[PDB]
Ligand binder design. Structure first.
Ligand SMILES: CN[C@@H]1C[C@H]2O[C@@](C)([C@@H]1OC)n1c3ccccc3c3c4c(c5c6c(n2c5c31)CCCC6)C(=O)NC4
Length: 262
C-alpha cells in the first residue's frame, strides 16, 4: 500500500486544493493535494489517486503516498520547486531557458506521452499550465484528474462537459470524442505555447469562432524562430482527420533525433 500516516507531514501553504508539505521522517518537501471532508468529489479524487498508482515514469509527477482511510483526505506527491511550465516560461530569463532547452522540454513531455500511449491512457487535459518544473529544466506531466485508461480507442465526454476550447481537437468539440489522437492535438498546441514562451493560443480570437475557423482550415501561424521540423510536427498534430495525426511514439522519436542534433 501507499496508505500512510497523516501525522508525518508538517503542512505549510497554498499552491480541491494543493499545499506545500514536509514529510518530517525524511527531511523532505512534498506536494499534498487535499480534499475538504464533506464535498463529494470523493468519487472523482479517489479515481485520480487510483490512476496515479498505476503510472510511473521520470517525466510524470510521482505519487509518493496517500491518506484515504479517514478524511481530511490527502494525495502526497513529489514536489517540483519551479511550479507550472506556463508561468515558468513567461517569467524566465530566455538566455538561460534557450532554444535547445525548449527542445528538451518538448522531448521529455513526448517521452511521458508515448508511455501513456503504450498503456492506453489519455491525459485529456494536456497544457503548459499542467506541466511542472524542477532543477536543471526537469519537466513532468501532472494533474491526472481527467486521465482515464480507455477500453477501446475512444472516451466520449458527457454532453455539456466544459473543455478548454483552444486546446481541444475538432472531433472533441463537435462529438465529444476524445482519444490518444485528441491529446496529440493538445500536445501540438503546447508546443506552440513552448515556442512562444507561454502566449495564449489563437490570440485575439473569441472561443465562439475557433471551430468554424479550424473547419475552414485556419491554424496558428508559425511563431518566431520555431524550427522547421517543430512547426511541421505542430501542423501534423493539427490534422482535421485524427488518423492523419502522428503518434506519440512517432513524435518522441522525431524529438529524440532533433534534440541530439543540437
Ligand atoms: C514509506 N516510504 C516512502 C515511500 C515513498 O516516499 C518516500 C518518502 C519513502 O520511501 C523511501 N521516499 C523518499 C524519501 C527520501 C528520499 C527519496 C525518497 C523516495 C523516492 C522514491 C519513492 C517512491 C515512493 N516513495 C519514495 C521515496 C512510493 C512508491 C513509488 C516510488 C523514488 O521512486 N525515488 C526516490
Amino acid at each position: 500500500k501507499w496508505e500512510m500516516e497523516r501525522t508525518d507531514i508538517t503542512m505549510k501553504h497554498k499552491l480541491g486544493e494543493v499545499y506545500e508539505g514536509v514529510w518530517k521522517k525524511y527531511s523532505l518537501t512534498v506536494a499534498v493535494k487535499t480534499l475538504k471532508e464533506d464535498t463529494m468529489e470523493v468519487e472523482e479524487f479517489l479515481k485520480e489517486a487510483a490512476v496515479m498508482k498505476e503510472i510511473k515514469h521520470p517525466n510524470l509527477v510521482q505519487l509518493l503516498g496517500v491518506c484515504t482511510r479517514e478524511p481530511p483526505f490527502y494525495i502526497i506527491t513529489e514536489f517540483m520547486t519551479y511550479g507550472n511550465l506556463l508561468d515558468y516560461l513567461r517569467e524566465c530569463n530566455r538566455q538561460e531557458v534557450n532554444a535547445v532547452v525548449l527542445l528538451y522540454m518538448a522531448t521529455q513531455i513526448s517521452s511521458a506521452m508515448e508511455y501513456l500511449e503504450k498503456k492506453n491512457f489519455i491525459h485529456r487535459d494536456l497544457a503548459a499550465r499542467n506541466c511542472l518544473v524542477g532543477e536543471n529544466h526537469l519537466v513532468k506531466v501532472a494533474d491526472f484528474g481527467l486521465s482515464r485508461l480507455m477500453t477501446g480507442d475512444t472516451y466520449t465526454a458527457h454532453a455539456g462537459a466544459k473543455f478548454p476550447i483552444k486546446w481541444t481537437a475538432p472531433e472533441s468539440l463537435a462529438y465529444n470524442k476524445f482519444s490518444i489522437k485528441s491529446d496529440v492535438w493538445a500536445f501540438g498546441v503546447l508546443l506552440w505555447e513552448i515556442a512562444t514562451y507561454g502566449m495564449s493560443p489563437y490570440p485575439g480570437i473569441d472561443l465562439s469562432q475557433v471551430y468554424e475557423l479550424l473547419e475552414k482550415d485556419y491554424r496558428m501561424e508559425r511563431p518566431e524562430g520555431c524550427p522547421e521540423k517543430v512547426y511541421e510536427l505542430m501542423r501534423a498534430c493539427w490534422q482535421w482527420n485524427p488518423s492523419d495525426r502522428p503518434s506519440f511514439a512517432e513524435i518522441h522519436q522525431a524529438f529524440e533525433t532533433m534534440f541530439q542534433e543540437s
